[PDB]
Design a protein around this ligand. Structure first.
Ligand SMILES: [Mg+2]
Ligand SMILES: [Mg+2]
Ligand SMILES: [Mg+2]
Ligand SMILES: [Mg+2]
Ligand SMILES: [Mg+2]
Ligand SMILES: [Mg+2]
Ligand SMILES: [Mg+2]
Ligand SMILES: [Mg+2]
Ligand SMILES: [Mg+2]
Ligand SMILES: [Mg+2]
Ligand SMILES: [Mg+2]
Ligand SMILES: [Mg+2]
Ligand SMILES: [Mg+2]
Ligand SMILES: [Mg+2]
Ligand SMILES: [Mg+2]
Ligand SMILES: [Mg+2]
Ligand SMILES: [Mg+2]
Ligand SMILES: [Mg+2]
Ligand SMILES: [Mg+2]
Ligand SMILES: [Mg+2]
Ligand SMILES: [Mg+2]
Ligand SMILES: [Mg+2]
Ligand SMILES: [Mg+2]
Ligand SMILES: [Mg+2]
Ligand SMILES: [Mg+2]
Ligand SMILES: [Mg+2]
Ligand SMILES: [Mg+2]
Ligand SMILES: [Mg+2]
Ligand SMILES: [Mg+2]
Ligand SMILES: [Mg+2]
Ligand SMILES: [Mg+2]
Ligand SMILES: [Mg+2]
Ligand SMILES: [Mg+2]
Ligand SMILES: [Mg+2]
Ligand SMILES: [Mg+2]
Ligand SMILES: [Mg+2]
Ligand SMILES: [Mg+2]
Ligand SMILES: [Mg+2]
Ligand SMILES: [Mg+2]
Ligand SMILES: [Mg+2]
Ligand SMILES: [Mg+2]
Ligand SMILES: [Mg+2]
Ligand SMILES: [Mg+2]
Ligand SMILES: [Mg+2]
Ligand SMILES: [Mg+2]
Ligand SMILES: [Mg+2]
Ligand SMILES: [Mg+2]
Ligand SMILES: [Mg+2]
Ligand SMILES: [Mg+2]
Ligand SMILES: [Mg+2]
Ligand SMILES: [Mg+2]
Ligand SMILES: [Mg+2]
Ligand SMILES: [Mg+2]
Lengths: 85, 200, 113
RNA sequence: UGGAGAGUUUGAUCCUGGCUCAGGACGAACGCUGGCGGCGUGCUUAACACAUGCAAGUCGAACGGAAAGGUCUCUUCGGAGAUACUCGAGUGGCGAACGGGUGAGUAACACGUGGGUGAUCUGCCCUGCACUUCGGGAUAAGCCUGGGAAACUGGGUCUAAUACCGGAUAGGACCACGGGAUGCAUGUCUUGUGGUGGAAAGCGCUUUAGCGGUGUGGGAUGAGCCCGCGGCCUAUCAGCUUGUUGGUGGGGUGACGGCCUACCAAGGCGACGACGGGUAGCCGGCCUGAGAGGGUGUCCGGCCACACUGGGACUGAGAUACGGCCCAGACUCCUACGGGAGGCAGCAGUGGGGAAUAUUGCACAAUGGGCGCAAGCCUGAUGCAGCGACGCCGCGUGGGGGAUGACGGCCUUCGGGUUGUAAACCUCUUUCACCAUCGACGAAGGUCCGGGUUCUCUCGGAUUGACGGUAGGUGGAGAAGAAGCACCGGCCAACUACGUGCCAGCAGCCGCGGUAAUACGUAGGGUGCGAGCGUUGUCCGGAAUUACUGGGCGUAAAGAGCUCGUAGGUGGUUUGUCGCGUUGUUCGUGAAAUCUCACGGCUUAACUGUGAGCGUGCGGGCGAUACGGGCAGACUAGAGU
């Protein structure tokens, strides 16, 4: 890079990439553990991992990681995947 | 630009006394050149060209400038030959001529060109300044007590003042009541042949 | 943001300006959203007109004037009546009416006769 | 309110019918020539390769700090203390997605116009509302060291924050059940109970300086996606299509959706031109034309697409990410051979290609933009200047008298004629350039110093303009410094002489020249035009020679060898209805510039500003039913039995 403020911003992009990669990857495991609970047919852990997965999706939406409309799509899918059981 | 040449030679060819009065013309009222005595061929294009060549060297207007006068004369409502000379009579050096502040058409142009006239207290030096209704055309302060201007004070009788302008006394300032319509134009040219020239 | 700005649209040495409710992400002579006045800084006072009931619309909804337009809205009293300042009257001055084309022409008749 | 023709088929004529010319225009080039000013405008070819400088930063009123400047003090005669105005490097915030450039790609929802979004997003700005609360661990910088030729990079200690991380409460996050409004099928908005949940940040003050933080109701702006209709050539391209076309369950996205996936169903497109080939950015507009049309997309303005070629993402409200990242490829340069760096289709500029297109200019004064409380800093955007008659417009190169019509020139029926009032001479006026001299409007602003509390505001001053000692004003000397170019057989304005003899050569047409050439070369004269004039190229006109306006087919080019028949086009008489075609009105839109009309400002004009038209169309409301059509009938004359 050539402009002084683009060497400065190439470093601040790489921190925010490593920050957002770790937060998004935590949501894929917390969705998965609900999927492996609801597909087994427990209704015990899945009703108390629904409260904890949806609570992480809202916190990533306030940290500027996913969008507020994306949190509202994944929470409504998993809450409707509890009432099937 | 300007022609700046023999003024009789381009009045012999058109067969019409353009400048007012000539003794060089009417001694040879036939067209110039070494073949100046033979008869001409009656073409329809010649009678429309040499009618437009009248209007240029009468007023000292060039072809690229005279053509623009046609382009708005044909565009104003009314007629076309009427409004061609209407926007041609209102040139400032023509107003100085008809007011009698000169003798010929060329000397009425240098008096406008060399800065001897204001209009509304505005120092003009353009010959093609089209005056309008109510335009006073005054004269400069330095222009008085000068030889070619006070020659135009005792010679205020030999040519009439047209009905559309009006000259006043010891303050030589020319007042314009309205634009000239048709009848108070001096007519050496017919007007329905310049109109038929540019339609070719 | 929404910027009320000036737009250069005269000759080379004669900058006739307009007053245009434009966007900040826009060049000068782009699409205005509503042209609400003109400003001619070559006359002897100057020539200033603001619509004064549409400039009250854009100020009441969030337009930000640029710094020479902020001077002009204080002159025509449209800035003061939006805020609540005491100077709600117009401190704008217009040029003096010159004697017209007909009245000077008739007066030159009676001066010679 | 606006329409012109002429030459050439024949011994002659009238037709048909080509070809050719007279007009206008240009981002032009070329030839000859060249005075000035105003105002526009200038790589059309190689989206070819690029040396050098510049084109995006800012904030100490977010934070730790002290390399530079300035001080208080202290010491040495050149060392200290960040605490102290200020500030290199560094962390953090916002900007860097705008602004500028280019037209390679795209026949497409890319663009134009009109609608949809009950299928969406929207930083900074405005406004209504609640809130700003507990804590926690690090690292850049610093310092000490390791690796590397460089570009850069490892490790240990150490310091913050509005950087980062974890809790509390806070409805427009979600699930289930309701109520009340609505409609256009999914539904949408407003509410209620119950169950789960989601925020933040402080800094500064000559003490009412002041700036901020988060979550939400609503506006404003910008954007996404989808649809009707419209704008090229080709059938010597007629079968294309399998995530293709539709459904369900999930995934996905800001959002609907085969966008993705699994299974099921067998579709979808096409002679109203699908699939394919060729070419092309589109539009406002521009040039032409009486108009209808035809050609075009250059300056300026809107939109799209791309940034050395191909692909991919990250950050973020927002990404084709020109002056970011990663990878592969081609080409240039460095190397210690292990490895590294680079992208002018930004502004000037260089090479190359070409018939052809400019300065390595000045300045933030103005307007626009970025950050900052602000002062300011940044801005090759921009405002202007340089060069080229490149175009348009304006003005000069003298004027008033003046025959002895002088010399000279050419022609001469040898008498004269003509250049020619043109020169000579006399006389007058200085526009432009020239010399000297005063010298701006663009600046009711941008800053400092006083009354004003604050915001605001004059009474009122200092200084502040790149253009520029310019534009313009005043004064001086003298006609003084300044004209060309093509054409002259007809079309087509305008003719004689001599030289040359089918030679030299001319020409757009068809023709000219073979010993008296108005057609070739010179001279005199003429004519058109004028700082320009001619040629070449390209486009429209004339061309009613693609004919809607506005043509034809026995013999001139032109009726299929004849019938039957599918799609299509068109339809007798008459009653009722619908109101799609048609038509009236009204509202919304048809951006600004351009164009026409009316006036105003530049000394006029070009140029420019303002008002009204134009914007042929399209969308919503409300009228009309004569005609065309739809629907429900009737009749018998066409047609058939
Ligand atoms: Mg920074
Ligand atoms: Mg994992
Ligand atoms: Mg979903
Ligand atoms: Mg001219
Ligand atoms: Mg024949
Ligand atoms: Mg013949
Ligand atoms: Mg030339
Ligand atoms: Mg030359
Ligand atoms: Mg120029
Ligand atoms: Mg190019
Ligand atoms: Mg290149
Ligand atoms: Mg610093
Ligand atoms: Mg800030
Ligand atoms: Mg960009
Ligand atoms: Mg270009
Ligand atoms: Mg610490
Ligand atoms: Mg909570
Ligand atoms: Mg917290
Ligand atoms: Mg499948
Ligand atoms: Mg679905
Ligand atoms: Mg599906
Ligand atoms: Mg192309
Ligand atoms: Mg025609
Ligand atoms: Mg363009
Ligand atoms: Mg993102
Ligand atoms: Mg960038
Ligand atoms: Mg670049
Ligand atoms: Mg360049
Ligand atoms: Mg070359
Ligand atoms: Mg500036
Ligand atoms: Mg500024
Ligand atoms: Mg010039
Ligand atoms: Mg003078
Ligand atoms: Mg002739
Ligand atoms: Mg001879
Ligand atoms: Mg000859
Ligand atoms: Mg030609
Ligand atoms: Mg033609
Ligand atoms: Mg035609
Ligand atoms: Mg015919
Ligand atoms: Mg027939
Ligand atoms: Mg025959
Ligand atoms: Mg035949
Ligand atoms: Mg037959
Ligand atoms: Mg049929
Ligand atoms: Mg039918
Ligand atoms: Mg019928
Ligand atoms: Mg006008
Ligand atoms: Mg005027
Ligand atoms: Mg105009
Ligand atoms: Mg318009
Ligand atoms: Mg209607
Ligand atoms: Mg019968």
């Amino acid at each position: 890079a050539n402009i002084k403020s683009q060497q400065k911003r190439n470093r601040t992009n790489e921190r925010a990439r490593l920050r957002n990669k770790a937060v998004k990857s935590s949501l894929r495991t917390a969705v998965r553990a609900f999927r492996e609970a609801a597909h087994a047919g427990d209704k015990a852990k899945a009703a108390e991992l629904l409260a904890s997965t949806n609570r992480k999706l809202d916190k990533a939406a306030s940290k500027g990681v996913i969008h507020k409309n994306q949190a509202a799509n994944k929470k409504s899918a998993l809450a409707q995947a509890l009432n099937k059981l | 630009a300007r022609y700046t040449g023999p003024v009789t030679r381009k009045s012999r060819r058109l067969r019409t006394d353009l400048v007012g009065g000539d003794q060089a013309f009417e001694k040879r009222p036939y067209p110039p050149g070494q073949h100046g005595r033979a008869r001409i061929k009656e073409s329809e294009y010649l009678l429309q060209l040499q009618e437009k060549q009248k209007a240029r060297f009468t007023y000292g207007v060039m072809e690229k400038q005279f053509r623009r006068y046609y382009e708005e004369a044909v565009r104003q409502p009314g007629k076309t030959g009427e409004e061609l000379l209407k926007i041609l009579e209102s040139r400032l050096d023509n107003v100085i001529y008809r007011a009698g502040l000169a003798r010929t058409r060329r000397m009425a142009r240098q008096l406008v060109s060399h800065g001897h006239f204001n209009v509304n207290g505005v120092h003009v030096n353009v010959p093609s300044y089209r005056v309008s209704q109510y335009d006073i055309v005054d004269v400069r302060d330095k222009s008085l007590n000068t030889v070619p201007f006070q020659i135009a004070r005792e010679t205020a009788g030999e040519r009439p003042i047209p009905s559309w302008l009006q000259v006043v006394g010891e303050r030589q300032r020319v007042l314009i009541h309205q634009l000239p319509e048709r009848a108070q134009i001096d007519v050496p040219l017919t007007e329905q042949l310049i109109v038929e020239y540019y339609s070719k | 943001a929404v910027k009320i700005k000036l737009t250069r649209l005269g000759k080379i040495r004669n900058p006739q300006y307009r007053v245009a409710v434009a966007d900040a992400r826009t060049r000068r002579d782009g699409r205005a959203i509503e042209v609400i006045g003109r400003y001619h800084p070559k006359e002897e006072p100057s020539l200033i007109e603001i619509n004064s009931e549409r400039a009250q619309y854009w100020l009441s909804v969030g337009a930000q004037p640029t710094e020479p337009v902020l001077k002009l809205l204080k002159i025509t009293g449209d800035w003061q009546k939006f805020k609540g300042l005491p100077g709600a009257q117009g401190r704008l001055k217009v040029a003096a009416p010159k004697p017209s084309k007909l009245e000077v022409f008739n007066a030159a008749l009676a001066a010679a006769d």
